[PDB]
């Protein structure tokens, strides 16, 4: 976003205002005024690493530049506005994450290595990878039986179409030392619940083969062989 | 798949580090720890 002054550097401001938001939403729901339009009107701006060296971004639109002005203790400790001459405001901080990281709920409460591990694992999860799997003929396809969208989502997962191609299920987990059969990681899974279909999955494997590659007369043929000096 | 299409490589200076300038351009989290940790990146 592009910070600006207005009647005052007070009351300095994002150029973009609720009117533009309205127009955007309208275009969104029309299913006329697209991001490119934001570009042309110069409310938003492309910034690269070099130019970044000479700007002053604000994290959150409002609180970072309302003015200089009782707090919920549970809320984290935000610093302040503390400065005036901003020039840009971040669109939304959660966008520093990549794709894989955007799956994680509350990744701001985790210890970073954990985030990295998840980012790696998420590419192993079974789940529907494409809506037409039954037509593709490729090696090694794994399809979940009854995927489910997660209950705890993040906004970004909407843009990854995740909640339409989810890659797991919501288990009723219980954290407990039950019979020591689940320590030093994992765990106990309800057998009956499995029978109900939990975490079932389909596996498809494709075998390819063709007739002779070579040999003018060496010509491999498909048929049912017998003891014909075979 | 999506992640794959936005991956990024570096051949071969502390290139495995996470430099500040990566802010907002490269995922601070996702990277194939292992030999390639820090080299392969994602947008």
């Amino acid at each position: 976003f592009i910070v600006e002054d207005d009647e005052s550097l007070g009351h300095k401001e994002l150029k973009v205002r609720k009117g533009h938001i309205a127009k955007l939403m309208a275009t969104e729901y029309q299913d006329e005024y697209t991001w490119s339009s934001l570009l042309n009107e110069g409310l938003v701006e492309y910034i690269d690493a070099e130019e970044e060296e000479s700007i002053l971004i604000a994290m959150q639109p409002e609180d970072l530049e309302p003015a200089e002005a009782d707090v919920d203790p549970a809320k984290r400790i935000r610093v302040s506005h503390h400065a005036t001459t901003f020039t840009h405001c971040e669109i939304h901080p959660s966008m520093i994450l990549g794709v894989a990281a955007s799956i994680i709920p509350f990744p701001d409460h985790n210890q970073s290595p954990r985030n990295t591990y998840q980012s790696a694992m998420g590419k192993q999860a079974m789940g529907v990878f494409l809506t037409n799997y039954n037509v593709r003929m490729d090696t090694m396809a794994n399809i979940l039986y009854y995927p489910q969208k997660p209950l705890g989502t993040t906004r970004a997962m909407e843009y990854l179409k995740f909640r339409e191609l989810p890659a797991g299920q919501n288990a009723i987990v219980a954290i407990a030392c039950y019979s020591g059969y689940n320590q030093e990681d994992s765990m106990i899974m309800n057998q009956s619940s499995i029978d109900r279909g939990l975490f079932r999955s389909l596996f498809f494997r494709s075998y390819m083969d063709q007739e002779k590659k070579y040999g003018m007369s060496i010509t491999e043929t498909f048929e049912k062989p017998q003891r014909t000096n075979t | 798949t999506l992640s794959h299409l936005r991956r990024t490589n570096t051949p071969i200076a502390k290139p495995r580090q996470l430099h500040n300038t990566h802010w907002g351009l490269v995922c601070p989290a996702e990277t194939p720890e292992g030999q390639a940790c820090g080299l392969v990146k994602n947008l």
Partner: peptide, 30 residues
């Protein structure tokens, strides 16, 4: 009003404007 400022919530609209005219593999195609 329409010139009114923006709440942090609004930004998700903007985001959705992006990703509509970009897609997620924009750079490969471009």
């Amino acid at each position: 009003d329409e010139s009114a400022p923006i709440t942090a919530e609004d930004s998700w609209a903007v985001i959705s404007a992006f990703f509509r005219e970009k897609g997620l593999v924009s750079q490969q195609l471009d």
